Structure 1
Amino acid sequence: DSMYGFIGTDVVLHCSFANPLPGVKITQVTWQKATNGSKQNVAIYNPAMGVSVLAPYRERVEFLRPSFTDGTIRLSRLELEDEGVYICEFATFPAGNRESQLNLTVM
């Protein structure tokens, strides 16, 4: 998936989970950026304990509605450095980690 955003602006990134079969529990959603060689996590949601947003995104990233039927966050005030692959990782049971990906372009 490819998304486009403008600097200073905001983009809404979506979590593209397909069809969650019977009977997988979806436990968790983690947003991740591929940078430098691996991932680091951007934000995590879990109905169990709620929402956590990680540095350096602590003031730019926020969940919209917290859910897996969504998985949708908001990036604010875009920056050249934000361009790249964003992974949406889902902790499912008993299937394990399931992920999706999107490329962001900042213009």
Structure 2
Amino acid sequence: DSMYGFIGTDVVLHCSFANPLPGVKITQVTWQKATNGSKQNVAIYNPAMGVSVLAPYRERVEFLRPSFTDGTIRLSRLELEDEGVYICEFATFPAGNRESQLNLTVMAK
């Protein structure tokens, strides 16, 4: 999947877990951004322990409707360096982690 947004804009990165398997426990959701490729965490949502946004995103990223099965965020005031692959990972037990990716491309205006 691919997204496009112009500099200065806000953009909504979708991430949901469906259909949660019966017997699978979900523990947290995490967004990562991949470089060359060497992942860094963007934001973490742990339903029990709360949210954490990592620099350089600390004011520009917010979970919209955070829950066990939703990690959708709004990435605000896009910059060129925000371009790249974004990975959303659910930590689950006993079956391990489940991911989805999206290429984001930021455009000049």
TM-score class, shorter-chain normalisation, is over 0.9
Superposition deviation, residue 16 in structure 1: 4.2
Number of aligned residue pairs: give it: 107
State the alpha-carbon separation in 2 of the partners of residues 99 and 15 from structure 1. Answer: 9
Aligned to 1:75: 75
Aligned to 2:97: 97
Stretch of structure 1 that moved more, 10-19 or 70-79: 10-19
More strand by share: 1
Q: Cα deviation per residue 1:54-93 (whole Å; 9 max; x = unaligned)?
A: 0111011111111243211010110111111000011011
Stretch of structure 1 that moved more, 52-61 or 11-20: 11-20
- Sequence identity (%): 100
Q: TM-score, normalised by structure 1?
A: 0.93
State the alpha-carbon separation in 1 of the partners of residues 95 and 64 from structure 2. Answer: 26
Q: TM-score, normalised by structure 2?
A: 0.91
Residue pair 2:18, 2:69 contacting (<8 A) in 1 also: no
Superposition deviation, residue 17 in structure 1: 3.0
State the alpha-carbon separation in 1 of the partners of residues 46 and 84 from structure 2. Answer: 25
Residue pair 2:60, 2:75 contacting (<8 A) in 1 also: yes
Residue pair 1:16, 1:100 contacting (<8 A) in 2 also: no
Stretch of structure 1 that moved more, 62-71 or 77-86: 62-71
Q: Unmatched 5+ residue regions in structure 2?
A: none
Residue pair 2:16, 2:72 contacting (<8 A) in 1 also: no
* CA RMSD after TM alignment: 1.2
State the alpha-carbon separation in 2 of the partners of residues 18 and 85 from structure 1. Answer: 21
Aligned to 2:24: 24
Superposition deviation, residue 98 in structure 1: 1.4
Q: Cα deviation per residue 1:18-47 (whole Å; 9 max; x = unaligned)?
A: 422111111110000001431010000011
